[PDB]
Design a protein around this ligand. Structure first.
Ligand SMILES: O=C(O)c1cc(-c2ccc3ncccc3c2)cc(-c2ccc3cccnc3c2)c1
Length: 242
């Protein structure tokens, strides 16, 4: 069911990095990782939490649809793309934390906690501030747990409406060409050690889907592009993408 391929460690070592990639072949129901231990270690989800947060916000009507405009609150922040109006699509694309912090406040602790339990999401623990717990609270999730959650989303099996799941999968669209479609979400956790980058999602092919979840040590923001670059090198090595 599970196979360890340490040859992928070369892709981290080449960049003086360390991390884990987890792949799941949906047709064959087989998983692959370079590091079985780290594949099951739990980290803060950081902005990968925007996936469940979007689902919950949509299903509760906090977000009407993917066109609803969340106006900039006029507070200048140091990421220029955040100092502007957003909808669900652009808020996901630019990982707009303050938009999602307001979602969480409107969702509220009780409904957030119940929904994460229904999703079987990570350690399901929202201890901390309702508007920051995915950044510095008690919630934790492993790469294998990310894949379990994403597989449910892909199959519309989460306990929210089909509509909510379709909208979030639309909002996850990251790349598409004639060979594959990637729906995914990045994350960068810095408030609690170890600092890590995330990329989780899946690759749609004509006749299969490959789920992936990676995290890697990320001491500075300078290496954030390696999240996608390393993942894609693994995908290329395994002949999943050209
Ligand atoms: O994971 C990522 O790819 C990433 C993470 C962050 C991010 C995530 C969570 C945080 N939580 C608390 C405080 C600051 C946080 C910052 C920001 C950006 C980002 C987004 C839009 C940009 C547009 C232009 C230039 N650069 C940009 C950088 C990317």
């Amino acid at each position: 069911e599970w196979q360890e391929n340490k040859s992928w460690n070369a892709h981290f070592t080449e960049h003086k990095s360390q991390g884990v990639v987890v792949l799941w072949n949906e047709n064959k129901q087989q998983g692959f990782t370079n590091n079985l231990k780290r594949a099951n270690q739990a980290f803060l989800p950081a902005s990968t939490f925007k996936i469940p947060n979007s689902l919950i916000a949509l299903d509760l009507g906090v977000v009407k649809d993917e066109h609803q405009v969340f106006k900039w609150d006029g507070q200048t922040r140091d990421i220029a793309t955040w100092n502007r109006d957003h909808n669900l699509i652009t808020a996901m694309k630019y990982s707009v934390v303050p938009v999602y912090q307001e979602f969480a406040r409107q969702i509220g602790e009780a409904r957030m906690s119940k929904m994460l339990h229904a999703f079987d999401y990570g350690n399901e623990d929202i201890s901390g501030n309702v508007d920051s717990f995915w950044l510095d609270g008690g919630i934790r999730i492993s790469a294998t747990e990310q894949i379990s959650f994403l597989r449910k989303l892909y199959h519309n099996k989460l306990h929210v409406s089909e509509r909510s799941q379709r909208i979030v999968k639309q909002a996850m669209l990251t790349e598409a060409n004639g060979d594959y479609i990637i729906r995914a979400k990045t994350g960068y956790s810095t408030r609690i050690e170890p600092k890590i980058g995330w990329w989780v999602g899946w690759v749609e092919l004509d006749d299969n889907v490959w789920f992936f979840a990676m995290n890697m040590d990320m001491p500075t923001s300078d290496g954030l592009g390696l999240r996608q670059a390393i993942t894609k090198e693994v995908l290329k090595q395994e002949k999943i993408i050209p």
